[PDB]
Amino acid sequence: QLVESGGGLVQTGGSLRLSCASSGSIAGFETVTWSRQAPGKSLQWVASMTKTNNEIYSDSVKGRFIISRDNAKNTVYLQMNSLKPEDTGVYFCKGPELRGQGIQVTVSS
Amino acid sequence: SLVNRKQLEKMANVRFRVQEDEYVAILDALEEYHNMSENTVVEKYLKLKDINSLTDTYIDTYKKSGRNKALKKFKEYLVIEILELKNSNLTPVEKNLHFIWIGGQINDTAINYINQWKDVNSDYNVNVFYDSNAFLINTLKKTIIESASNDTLESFRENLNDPEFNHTAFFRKRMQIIYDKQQNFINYYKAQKEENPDLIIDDIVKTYLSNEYSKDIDELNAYIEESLNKVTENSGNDVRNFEEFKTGEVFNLYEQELVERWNLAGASDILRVAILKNIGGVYLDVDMLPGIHPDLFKDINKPDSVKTAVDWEEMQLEAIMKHKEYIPEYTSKHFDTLDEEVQSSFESVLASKSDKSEIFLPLGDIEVSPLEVKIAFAKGSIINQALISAKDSYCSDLLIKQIQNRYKILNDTLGPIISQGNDFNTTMNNFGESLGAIANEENISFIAKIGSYLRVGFYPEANTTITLSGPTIYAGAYKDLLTFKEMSIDTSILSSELRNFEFPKVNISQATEQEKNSLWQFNEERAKIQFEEYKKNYFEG
Numbered sequence: 001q002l003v004e005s006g007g008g009l010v011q012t013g014g015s016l017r018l019s020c021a022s023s024g025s026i027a028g029f030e031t032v033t034w035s036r037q038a039p040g041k042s043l044q045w046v047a048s049m050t051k052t053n054n055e056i057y058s059d060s061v062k063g064r065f066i067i068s069r070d071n072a073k074n075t076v077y078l079q080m081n082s083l084k085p086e087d088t089g090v091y092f093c094k095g096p097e098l099r100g101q102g103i104q105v106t107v108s109s
Numbered sequence: 110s111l112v113n114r115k116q117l118e119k120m121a122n123v124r125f126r127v128q129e130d131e132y133v134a135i136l137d138a139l140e141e142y143h144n145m146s147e148n149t150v151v152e153k154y155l156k157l158k159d160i161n162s163l164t165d166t167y168i169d170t171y172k173k174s175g176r177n178k179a180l181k182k183f184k185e186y187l188v189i190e191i192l193e194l195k196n197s198n199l200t201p202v203e204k205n206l207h208f209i210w211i212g213g214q215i216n217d218t219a220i221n222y223i224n225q226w227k228d229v230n231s232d233y234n235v236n237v238f239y240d241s242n243a244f245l246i247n248t249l250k251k252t253i254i255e256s257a258s259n260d261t262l263e264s265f266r267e268n269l270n271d272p273e274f275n276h277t278a279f280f281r282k283r284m285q286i287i288y289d290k291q292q293n294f295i296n297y298y299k300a301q302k303e304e305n306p307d308l309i310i311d312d313i314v315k316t317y318l319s320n321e322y323s324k325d326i327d328e329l330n331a332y333i334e335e336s337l338n339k340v341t342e343n344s345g346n347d348v349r350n351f352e353e354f355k356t357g358e359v360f361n362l363y364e365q366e367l368v369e370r371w372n373l374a375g376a377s378d379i380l381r382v383a384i385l386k387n388i389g390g391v392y393l394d395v396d397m398l399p400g401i402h403p404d405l406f407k408d409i410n411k412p413d414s415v416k417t418a419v420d421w422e423e424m425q426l427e428a429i430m431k432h433k434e435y436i437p438e439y440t441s442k443h444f445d446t447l448d449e450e451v452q453s454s455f456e457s458v459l460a461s462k463s464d465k466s467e468i469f470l471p472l473g474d475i476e477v478s479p480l481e482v483k484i485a486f487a488k489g490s491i492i493n494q495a496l497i498s499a500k501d502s503y504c505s506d507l508l509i510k511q512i513q514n515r516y517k518i519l520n521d522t523l524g525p526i527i528s529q530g531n532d533f534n535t536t537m538n539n540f541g542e543s544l545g546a547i548a549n550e551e552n553i554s555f556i557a558k559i560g561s562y563l564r565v566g567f568y569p570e571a572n573t574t575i576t577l578s579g580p581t582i583y584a585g586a587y588k589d590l591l592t593f594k595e596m597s598i599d600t601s602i603l604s605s606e607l608r609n610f611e612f613p614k615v616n617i618s619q620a621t622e623q624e625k626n627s628l629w630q631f632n633e634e635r636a637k638i639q640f641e642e643y644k645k646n647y648f649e650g
């Protein structure tokens with residue numbers, strides 16, 4: 001009951017809005033972690049949103065990325081602007097008991 | 110130094126447990142912290158806060174995780190790192206000395222103390238903050254207190270010689286009348302400001318005093334002139350020119366204390382915080398004197414007949430003033446009780462040093478963390494009579510948030526009760542009930558201590574100011590800092606931790622004559638003396 005979308009291929013400088021939407025749970029995303037994995041790299045933390053609606057950003061991503069939730073806390077977004085080839089990878093949304101299969105993101109240059 | 114990524118990994122290792130995404134969030138953020146060579150002290154601090162939040166999130170997510178024990182230990186390590194940050198990375202303090210005299214004419218006594226700092230700190234800029242709009246606040250408070258005293262003595266004339274008619278009874282009855290008169294002025298002030306917003310405080314006060322107490326406007330005008338002139342010729346800096354303060358979010362609370370409460374100490378508690386945030390440097394109360402040079406009296410040992418460091422320091426200051434006369438009319442009451450042999454050691458050493466900078470220690474170059482405000486200690490407790498902050502210090506902003514939060518709770522509770530227009534006792538009983546309803550496990554330390562807000566400056570040991578804008582807000586701010594929070598109303602913290610914020614003792618003498626003369630409160634002893642004097646004068650002894 002989790003629908004992932006928003007990914008694809010952009011050129012350097014472009015934007016994407018990642019989306020994970022869940023249904024069938026009371027706030028399946030009341031805590032959310034965004035992670036990413038490039039091939040031949042370890043899973044890397046991108047951003048987080050606490051139960052207090054507190055937004056925490058990795059240094060490599062601050063000033064470019066915005067994490068957000070709807071009020072029901074069932075769908076989470078990742079606005080990513082000014083993308084670099086560095087940002088290329090598979091992105092994972094993680095709630096307390098939910099985790100996405102991964103959204104491919106490719107930045108071209 | 111804080112554990113690095115690999116060291117946390119060793120701590121929070123659980124065999125066979127896969128690294129969760131919320132764990133990797135922690136490890137990656139810790140690694141990012143260790144790669145912050147180029148970042149400011151507050152940036153580093155906010156990174157620690159981030160790590161703390163990520164850590165809390167993990168623990169909340171996997172409540173029975175085998176990692177939790179190590180992560181809770183890690184959380185404590187974060188606090189150690191804060192103190193390291195604080196204690197390791199110092200910037201120079203702006204060379205400003207800040208003083209405040211508001212509400213009336215600055216006294217020659219204040220000037221003379223101020224001049225001592227000036228004489229040994231030629232490299233320091235000095236400001237004495239005043240309020241050119243409110244020179245008559247002290248006149249108004251004095252007038253109203255005396256009028257209420259007379260009304261009280263009149264009303265209880267036949268009970269005055271009654272064995273049981275206490276000083277307590279006097280002050281209790283007088284409080285009721287003061288409230289009436291204070292509320293009378295306050296409502297006049299608010300109406301006047303609505304009718305004509307261009308009026309200044311002194312315009313309204315002198316009119317009120319003329320109308321209600323037949324005070325002479327020409328003599329009030331002449332006093333304003335004298336006051337303006339005296340402070341200007343003494344490093345005067347007008348609060349009404351302090352734009353950052355005037356347009357900031359605590360200016361209203363300052364005016365509350367100045368105009369409604371006639372609490373100049375409370376208003377000064379608020380001003381001093383804005384001063385250190387917006388300008389930075391060293392704040393001192395006007396009753397504070399420079400530290401005695403450490404090798405002036407090194408060779409005179411404390412007689413056993415003097416059994417506190419404070420009485421000794423007191424002795425030493427009186428010696429300087431007896432033999433050097435820097436400050437006219439400084440007491441020698443305590444110095445004189447000394448054995449002649451000791452007094453002779455004193456005069457002999459003071460005769461040898463002939464340069465004020467060898468008597469009083471110049472501040473010189475002081476350094477502080479950009480995270481903190483440094484505060485003086487007395488009686489093993491913190492006291493905001495002396496403060497050190499760089500401009501825009503982090504604790505500086507915590508202080509303003511403490512003030513805003515505390516006054517928000519107070520005003521939102523007290524305000525609607527006052528507006529019902531009841532008498533002091535009714536108002537007070539209802540206030541008490543409201544405090545009871547909004548009391549919870551968090552705010553109780555605060556709620557239990559604001560009940561006597563309306564008594565401040567009129568009743569023995571009316572102390573509320575301490576909790577509103579005094580030492581309590583500093584304990585709150587440091588707790589804020591050390592817990593990664595804001596507006597902490599429960600201010601429990603170790604005295605160990607508080608010692609990290611201590612104003613350097615060598616740089617002040619706190620045991621002055623004037624420190625013993627509180628201008629905003631009075632104790633029971635003083636209350637008993639005032640009462641007997643009020644009686645005598647009423648009977649015309």
Ligand SMILES: O=c1ccn([C@@H]2O[C@H](COP(=O)(O)OP(=O)(O)O)[C@@H](O)[C@H]2O)c(=O)[nH]1
Binds near residue numbers: 247
């Ligand atoms: O009429 C007054 C009374 C007090 N204060 C300010 O309040 C501070 C504290 O006064 P005091 O030393 O009497 O307070 P205590 O140390 O007894 O709490 C002073 O230094 C002033 O800055 C003021 O400006 N005008």
Ligand SMILES: OC[C@H]1O[C@H](O)[C@H](O)[C@@H](O)[C@@H]1O
Binds near residue numbers: 377378394575579
């Ligand atoms: O907090 C109210 C007052 O009491 C404090 O202990 C300080 O001595 C004084 O500077 C302050 O204005």
Ligand SMILES: [Mg+2]
Binds near residue numbers: 626
């Ligand atoms: Mg004093």
Ligand SMILES: [Mn+2]
Binds near residue numbers: 394396627
């Ligand atoms: Mn004092």
